[PDB]
Write an enzyme that holds these catalytic residues in place. Structure first.
Site, PDB file in Angstrom:
ATOM      1  N   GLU A  45       0.856  -1.194   0.000  1.00  0.00           N
ATOM      2  CA  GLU A  45       0.000   0.000   0.000  1.00  0.00           C
ATOM      3  C   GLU A  45       0.892   1.245   0.000  1.00  0.00           C
ATOM      4  OE1 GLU A  45      -3.564   0.524   2.788  1.00  0.00           O
ATOM      5  OE2 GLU A  45      -2.689   2.536   2.867  1.00  0.00           O
TER       6      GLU A  45
ATOM      7  N   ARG B 196       5.070   2.940  10.206  1.00  0.00           N
ATOM      8  CA  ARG B 196       3.734   2.599  10.721  1.00  0.00           C
ATOM      9  C   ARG B 196       3.729   1.552  11.850  1.00  0.00           C
ATOM     10  NH1 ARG B 196       1.155   4.762   5.804  1.00  0.00           N
ATOM     11  NH2 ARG B 196      -1.061   5.178   6.205  1.00  0.00           N
TER      12      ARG B 196
ATOM     13  N   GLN C 138      -8.400  -7.204  -0.917  1.00  0.00           N
ATOM     14  CA  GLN C 138      -9.451  -6.187  -0.848  1.00  0.00           C
ATOM     15  C   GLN C 138     -10.638  -6.572  -1.740  1.00  0.00           C
ATOM     16  OE1 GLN C 138      -8.225  -1.868  -0.561  1.00  0.00           O
ATOM     17  NE2 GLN C 138      -9.904  -1.515  -2.011  1.00  0.00           N
TER      18      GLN C 138
END
Lengths: 138, 358, 358, 135
Positions: B194, B203, B304
């Protein structure tokens, strides 16, 4: 029209025509014990070079070894591989050659097995299947 | 002519009739052998009784297809002609498709000539010639209670835990797994899908030292959080964490970097992130089924589209390429073939990035 | 005889040019001459004017085909000889069978030869094979004023109950699903499309037995979920609640689940999930109606998306064939022809999600 | 050779379709069969499922490219062909060049037989090499 195993036996007469410390373990592994009728004496001329100590190469060896064993070992050098060899390609040809005999163990005894067919025996002649099917399960 | 391959496997199992007698019937067999073979192959189950060619060699010689099959030669030469034992279904299907041929012939051929016969009746001929066709195990998570009510995380798994654009599938892999590589020794080969790893290394550290909410993207950190960053700096670059970020490709970036390291580090997990813009889906999704087969270890694949199976059932294999399909709404379950159906809850914060325990 | 005299009678009437061409459009003849008269018998009287050899043996002479059809040799006779033009049908009803074939020939071979010149399509030989051949009563709803202000449901109706999501999109496909199944003894069809197959069971174990509030999603359950459901867990797949496991199922993917489930099982109703999943949209609408009608049992078809509405009458006709068209946001109905269209009264408890009604 | 001993691993594994369509696709097979062998090798294990000779003999016999390819007369000859199913790589990084032989031969035999064109617009044949010879 060369079958499956004929080349796995060749996974030796080329891996020891070019690397002999990739041939000392064959003494330990495939004595042999070899499969083909002229491929035993070839090994018998391989390990005997390891003692005297001279210039070992693809074609320097294959002349020791007079005639017939050259339109054969030279045609064992018209090949398409390299000298980057694995530990699980070294643990692969362990079965290959020495066990092709066990594929035979479902042929010569079938001549007997299938001769119980001609006498209409299916009582006990329908058991050697287990001494075949569940014999190959090792 | 799948029949030949379709009949000679009820020996290899031998109970290769567990699904084979839970599927079709003897009629599908054209030759008078195979039918009356499978017909007398369907008298065993009365007890029963169980499975052996001999229980059929006292069955096709009893009702004399002894002189009406193919002789002894043709009997054993079925054990001798079927290799791949894990099919059966399958397999037996092509014959029903050879029988789908048969499902049409002596139906249509009837009618095609009915303009020379039922001439006559017609409305009768209609509605009938039509109504014919009317048929722990258990590789870790960090919060130990999560390799349990499902049981890992184990060899050969397409562990998919998906969510919407930046909800769970975005950083979920930066949580559970950083206890399989940093805590226990079962290393990885990661792919940031991503972002680049420069943003996917920015992150996960948020979880350690209670850091990244002031923030680091704009500025720096406060005095005591440096003496808490220095307590969070050495579990990533030092650690067996080796991500990959390469742009628009098919799938080859994995295997071009995940074959040499089979012998070196150890390979305890293989990591995957988002899907819908890596350039349909199953030729990229099956590229991970026979991979965990070849490399042999648990693998994470976050796809997804809710996520239910249904909404990711058209934008990915997912149900098939993975029995296991957890979610990110909580980690919603759907289809498990490894452990008990115990459900769980761990609360999510949404800032420091931590799914802290109940 | 049946085709040879088939031009002479309207040569004789001739305002009996209509009653046959009604029953037969221009593409139902054979001999490359009589049609050149038949289609011409339609391609003459367009004023005005109308039809006789004068104007018929003229436009054929205009389109130069009068020396290709015969000339005035076989032409003087047909007009002169045919004794009566009172039957007139006839003809378009007795030589119609040759056209019935010219309608039911090209389809069968498009199925049969799809198994030879094709094969080479897989399911198209299965299904585009099935394309051109055509060419309170009371059923227990289970509530109060949804049972009292609707009438039935009776057999054959195609319903469409839509709403704005979470509110009434999917919170109903479980309501009558356990009020005909757990009401009268039969084996109904309860589908799941928007939501995954059996994740919907971890949604109806939140309504039947009512286990979702302790929480069903936290680990296990409080000492208040136990003596509650097992005295009835032997009554869940025993009392008509079946579930479907398939993704991209179009219209030609489902009828069978009611073609072999009503003949051999039971099936008194077909509960289904929204259209946008079961995959221009009016012929398909004349196939869900023509399914509900073709089974004699009611059908649910939930939809999705001054003072005004019409915004569902707009998106492809829709509102007429699926006769009854309801609207929620709201619990007031908008269209139905059973009698009255009364304002429904229901509930949504969040936790139990159940329907206590007035 | 580099092809005449390839398909065995896909039976010996048999799920060795992943290192095949790995650096490759169904087109890198001149010999009229191997191509639509591999095309019949993909959509099969595109289910599913994974793999076995028979499931391969299916869609080929379906596309009747077993009347069009030949028959089972190769199945036993390729099941019995590979003397070790660990080459694989390999062999897909040594048989690349074998069909990569003609990646810039198609895009060059063009311009040569296409001096017989731009004459006309001359110049432009620069940017066909930039986006067909180059890559």
């Amino acid at each position: 029209l060369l079958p499956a195993f004929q080349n796995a036996e060749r996974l030796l007469l080329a891996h020891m025509m070019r690397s002999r410390d990739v041939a000392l373990v064959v003494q330990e592994r495939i004595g042999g014990r070899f499969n083909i009728e002229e491929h035993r004496a070839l090994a018998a001329y391989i390990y005997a070079f390891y003692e005297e100590g001279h210039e070992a190469d693809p074609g320097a060896l294959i002349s020791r070894i007079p005639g017939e064993l050259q339109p054969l070992a030279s045609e064992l050098s018209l090949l398409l591989i390299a000298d980057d060899v694995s530990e699980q390609e070294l643990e692969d040809y362990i079965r290959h050659v020495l066990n092709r005999p066990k594929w035979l163990m479902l042929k010569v005894k079938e001549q007997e097995k299938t001769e119980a067919e001609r006498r209409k025996d299916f009582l006990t002649a329908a058991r050697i299947a287990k001494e075949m099917i569940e014999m190959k399960k090792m | 002519e799948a029949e030949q391959a379709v009949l000679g496997a009820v020996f290899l199992d031998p109970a290769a009739l567990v699904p084979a007698s839970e599927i079709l019937i003897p009629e599908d067999f054209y030759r008078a052998a195979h039918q009356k073979i499978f017909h007398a192959m369907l008298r065993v189950a009365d007890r029963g009784e169980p499975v052996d060619l001999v229980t059929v060699t006292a069955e096709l010689a009893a009702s004399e297809q002894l002189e009406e099959i193919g002789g002894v030669s043709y009997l054993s030469e079925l054990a001798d002609a079927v290799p791949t034992a894990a099919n059966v279904e399958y397999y037996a299907r092509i014959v029903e498709e050879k029988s789908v041929l048969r499902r049409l012939i002596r139906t249509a051929t009837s009618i095609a000539q009915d303009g020379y016969t039922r001439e006559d009746e017609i409305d009768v001929l209609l509605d009938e010639a039509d109504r014919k066709i009317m048929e722990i195990t258990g590789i870790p998570t960090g919060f130990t209670e999560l390799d349990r009510m499902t049981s890992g995380f184990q060899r050969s798994d397409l562990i998919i835990v998906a969510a919407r654009p930046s909800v769970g599938k975005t950083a979920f892999a930066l949580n559970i797994a950083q206890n399989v590589a940093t805590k226990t020794n079962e290393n990885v080969a990661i792919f940031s899908l991503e972002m680049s790893a420069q943003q996917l290394v920015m992150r996960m550290l948020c979880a350690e030292g209670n850091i990244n909410a002031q923030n680091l993207r704009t500025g720096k950190l406060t005095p005591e959080d440096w003496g808490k960053l220095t307590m969070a700096m050495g579990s990533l670059s030092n650690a067996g964490i080796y991500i990959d970020d390469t742009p628009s490709i098919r799938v080859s970036d994995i295997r071009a970097k995940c074959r040499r390291l089979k012998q070196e580090s150890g390979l305890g997990m293989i990591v995957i992130d988002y899907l819908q813009l890596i350039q349909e889906v199953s030729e990229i999704s099956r590229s991970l089924k026979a991979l965990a087969r070849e490399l042999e270890v648990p693998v994470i694949a976050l796809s997804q589209l809710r996520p239910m199976m249904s909404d990711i059932r058209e934008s990915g294999s997912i149900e098939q390429d993975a029995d296991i399909v957890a979610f990110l709404y909580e980690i919603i379950i759907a289809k498990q073939r490894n452990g008990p159906v115990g459900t769980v809850q761990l609360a999510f914060i949404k800032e420091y990035n931590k799914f802290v325990n109940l």
